[PDB]
């Protein structure tokens, strides 16, 4: 059974673990994610969602800690990006750009605020409508990390410090680059309709494909895609973290210098804002 | 001022931040460590000390969380190992062996229980008496780490996983090796009376000395030390963590196959136990 306090504010409905629900007070739709009982993972997500404010990041509305873990969130009527790309379906380029531009803004915002998502994938990207022109929002912060001890060790004399810690200094502070990898893989999929790394018709093991950075390239498929779009993917799927493109570098790429796309984004953003916006002092 | 509850059980005395104190009930000496207010570091130490039980690991007796952080512990009348070695003083070999054997037992116990000290050094090693034949105990678990997510990532398909995480698998689970480095440096100091890595009369930077593993070797000094003892040091000051000696490998070294030393240890252990030991069913 659902906890009494939950039933008191919401009418639970169909499964979408995530199910649709209505807010009694307003009769509005909400999404409620359910997690059986890892307090820290849930605690981290709750901690993160409360403090964040960004159009391309999903908002928490309520939370209940009972027999299970119930998390109330905005409902995105478009569902998961995953459903758009599954089974070799491919989005048209301009649609990829509009979605990805928003994905970058979101992850940039996260990174600027010392948060690393660590689990970006099409099922964690939500669409705000059934229209293909729409707003996207990132979700699912269970696996996120918040940004130390190395800093603390460096302030002291390393008389007794093991050498592997000193060496590790050279690579520290590039954790957020993992998100940029996942982004590149998402963009590859969106643009082509198939994964860059897979155990389909290949002798090389998935791990080996990824570590070597040798994604499966199929000309026929990519022939329909621009060289700018592919270029950006090539810059995100860089094996070396230091060299890999950051969100900022991505947002400066010539593929995202598309004044139409940005305009259409402002529009969709404005429409969502309207009906939620108080009159302005002028 | 000291918190009322503290003064209620203890009479605070001289500074040794650590000061001597007496337990009202028993009139026994205790050591009380004081830390101004990093709850997590203190919390971790309290968490760790409560659960541990080992002769060469110091015991907590009480704790108070007030205007400051007060931690009550056993008093070691011998003070810090640091005072024995500071200013080029050097312990005789057999004394080094007896102390180090106990240091190994302690750190082995820690490691067996998923704890990494991370800050082993002569000031964190306490002597149970003013005699040079005595028991040692490790202390100060503020910086300790308790042993994951990598395991969790490996259970899933790495379709979106960045390559640096996969690579990191090859080096994971060797964190405890940092303690074995620190141990080697402690033993070097004890045996020779001088640090293996230092900015004394050398052009090479401390960091560079450590990463290259090239400790400063002074024949005249080491000529008085056995080849077995030096050998063990050479095996702990290995730059490569995988290859570095573990506590177990250390305890099997020919330098520690010394039946006299072990005997003298059993004795000291027995003496401490006596007066704390209930009559046995026989
Ligand atoms: N794991 C998450 O953090 C998370 C958080 C929130 C989520 N909302 C959906 C979702 C939304 C809409 C779907 O189609 C529908 C179904 C019913 C009505 C509707 O308008 C759209 C399907 C799934 N998936 C979510 C995942
Ligand atoms: N940082 C720690 O975790 C810690 C924890 C416990 C510690 N006890 C001493 C210590 C003990 C004895 C000393 O000489 C004396 C002083 C008075 C009486 C006596 O018998 C010995 C000096 C320092 N240092 C400690 C450090």
Q: What string of H, E and C letters represents the secondary structure of chain B? A: CCCHHHHHHEEEEEECCEEEEEECCCCEEEEEEEECCCHHHHHHHHHHHHHCCCCCECCEEEEEECCCEEEEECCCCCEECHHHHHHHCCCCHHHHHHHHHHHHHHHHHHHHCCEECCCCCHHHEEECCCCCCCCEEECCCCCCEECCHHHHHHCCCCCCCCHHHHHHHHHCCCCCHHHHHHHHHHHHHHHHCCCCCCCCCCCCCHHHHHHHCCCCCCHHHHCCCCHHHHHHHHHHCCCCCCCCCCHHHHHCCHHHCCHHHHHHHHHHHHHHHCCCCCCCCC
> What is the per-residue DSSP string for A176-205?
THHHHHHHHHHHHHHHHSS-SS-SSS-SS-
Q: Are A241 and A171 a contacting pair, CB within 8 Å?
A: yes
**Cα gap B245→B231, rounded to integer Å:** 11
Which chain A residue is nearest to residue B242, measuring alpha carbons? A164
- Closest among A79, A74, A117, A81 to A99, alpha carbons compared: A81
List the residue whose alpha carbon is closest to atom 18 of ligand 1.
Answer: A77
User: Which CATH architecture does the domain made up of A76-282 adopt?
Assistant: Orthogonal Bundle (1.10)
Residue A82 contacts residue A42 (beta carbons within 8 Å): no
Q: Pick the closest to residue B228 from B265, B194, B199, B258 (CA basis).
A: B258
In CATH, what class is A1-75? Answer: alpha beta
Each residue of A51-64: b (16+ CB within 10 Å) or e?
ebebbbbbebbebb
Q: Which of A160, A150, A152 is nearest to B81 (CA)?
A: A160
Closest CA to A245 of A180, A183, A171: A180
**Tokens 């026929």 belong to which residue?**
A220
Q: Which residues of A touch B (CB under 8 A)?
A: 119-121, 143, 149, 157-167, 174, 177-178, 181-182, 185-186, 195, 197-198, 206-207, 210-211, 213, 239, 241
Candidate from A166, A186, A210 with C-beta closest to B161? A210
Q: Do B165 and A159 touch (CB under 8 A)?
A: no
Q: Are B71 and B35 in contact (CB under 8 A)?
A: yes
Q: A225 to each of A181, B92, B160, how far by Cα in Å?
A: 20, 75, 21
Resolution of this structure in Å: 2.7
Contact, B251 vs B104, CB < 8 A?
A: yes
Domain limits, chain A: 1-75, 76-282
Q: Is A76 in the pocket of ligand 1 (CB under 6 A)?
A: yes
Sheet holding B125-127, edge to edge: B79-80, B125-127, B136-138
| Residues A125 and A102: beta-carbon distance below 8 Å | no
The SS3 assignment for A164 reads helix
Q: How many angstroms away from the CA of A281 is the closest CA of chain B?
A: 45
Closest ligand to residue A57's CA? 1
Q: Which of B25, B8, B54, B42 is nearest to B247 (CA)?
A: B54
Please, what is the angle between helix B227-236 and helix B177-192, to 10°? 150
Residue pair B34/B23 in contact (Cβ under 8 Å)? The answer is: no
Binding site membership of A79 for ligand 1 (Cβ less than 6 Å) = yes
Any idea which residue has 């070294």 for tokens?
A: B253
Q: Both tokens of residue A237?
A: 């799927």
Decide: B64 and B35 in contact? Cβ < 8 Å: no
Q: Is the CB of A138 under 6 A from ligand 1?
A: no
A36: helix, strand or coil = coil
**DSSP-based three-state secondary structure for A115:** strand
Nearest to A244 by CA among A153, A183, A180, A198: A180
Instruction: Tell me which residue in B121, B159, B174 faces A197 most closely, judged by beta carbons.
Output: B159
Runs of H (alpha helix) within A86-176: 93-112, 149-154, 163-168
User: Which residues form ligand 2's pocket by a CB distance below 6 Å?
Assistant: B 16, 18, 20, 31, 33, 73, 76-77, 79-80, 126, 139-140
Nearest to A177 by CA among A219, A222, A147, A208: A147
Alpha carbon B172 to its chain's center: 23
């Amino acid at each position: 059974v659902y906890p009494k306090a939950l039933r008191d504010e919401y009418i639970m409905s169909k499964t979408l673990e995530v199910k649709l629900a209505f807010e009694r007070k307003t009769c509005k739709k909400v999404a409620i994610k359910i997690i059986s009982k890892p307090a820290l993972n849930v605690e981290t997500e709750i901690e993160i969602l409360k403090k964040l404010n960004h159009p391309c990041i999903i908002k928490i509305k309520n939370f209940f800690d009972a027999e299970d873990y119930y998390i109330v969130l905005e409902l995105m009527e478009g569902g998961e990006l995953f459903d758009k790309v599954v089974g070799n379906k491919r989005l048209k380029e301009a649609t990829c750009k509009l979605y990805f531009y928003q994905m970058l803004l979101a992850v940039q915002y996260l990174h600027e605020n010392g948060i690393i998502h660590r689990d970006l994938k099409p099922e964690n990207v939500l669409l705000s409508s059934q229209e293909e022109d729409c707003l996207i929002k990132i979700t699912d912060f269970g696996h996120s990390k918040i940004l130390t001890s190395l800093m603390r060790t460096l302030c002291g004399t390393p008389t007794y410090l093991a050498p592997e810690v000193l060496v590790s200094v050279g690579t520290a502070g590039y954790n957020r680059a993992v998100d940029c990898w996942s982004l590149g893989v998402i963009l590859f999929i969106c643009l082509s309709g198939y994964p860059p790394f897979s155990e389909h018709r290949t002798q090389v093991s998935l791990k080996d494909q990824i570590t070597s950075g040798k994604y499966n390239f199929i000309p026929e498929v990519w022939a329909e895609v621009s060289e700018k779009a592919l270029d950006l993917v090539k810059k995100l799927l860089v094996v070396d973290p230091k060299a890999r493109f950051t969100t900022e570098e991505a947002l400066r790429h010539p593929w995202l210098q598309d004044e139409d796309m940005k305009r259409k984004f402002q529009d969709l953003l404005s429409e969502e804002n309207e009906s939620t916006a108080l009159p302005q002092v002028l």
